[PDB]
């Protein structure tokens, strides 16, 4: 369910700030981003919202999406 898609950026160092921004959110449990996939497998507490993280990344100058793969 909780999968996010990376857009706008490329990968790796881009995914690092994404993961950092995710962990900056106190609702995160375990954010593991797959740079070679272009997707993020972030586990969060039942209080945060995936659209909020997507908007967070999109509002960080990057682009996020969401697709469970």
UniProtKB/Swiss-Prot annotation:
TM spans (from-to): none
What range(s) does the HMA domain occupy? Answer: 2-65
Q: Where does a metal cation bind?
A: 11, 14
Q: What does this protein do?
A: Resistance to Hg(2+) in bacteria appears to be governed by a specialized system which includes mercuric reductase. MerA protein is responsible for volatilizing mercury as Hg(0). Plays a pivotal role in mercury resistance under thiol-depleted conditions and cell protection. Protects cells under thiol-depleted conditions.
* Protein family: Belongs to the class-I pyridine nucleotide-disulfide oxidoreductase family.
User: How does it associate, per the subunit comment?
Assistant: Homodimer.
Q: What else is known?
A: The active site is a redox-active disulfide bond.
Identification of the protein by name: Mercuric reductase
Question: Could you tell me which species this protein originates from?
Answer: Pseudomonas aeruginosa
Q: What is the lineage of its organism?
A: Bacteria, Pseudomonadati, Pseudomonadota, Gammaproteobacteria, Pseudomonadales
Location of this fragment in the whole protein:
1 to 69 of 561
């Amino acid at each position: 369910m909780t999968h996010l898609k990376i857009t706008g950026m490329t990968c790796d160092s881009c995914a690092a700030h994404v993961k950092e921004a995710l962990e900056k959110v106190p609702g995160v449990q375990s954010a593991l981003v797959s740079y070679p996939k272009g997707t993020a497998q972030l586990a969060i507490v039942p209080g945060t919202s995936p659209d909020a993280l997507t908007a967070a990344v999109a509002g960080l100058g990057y682009k996020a999406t969401l697709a469970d793969a």
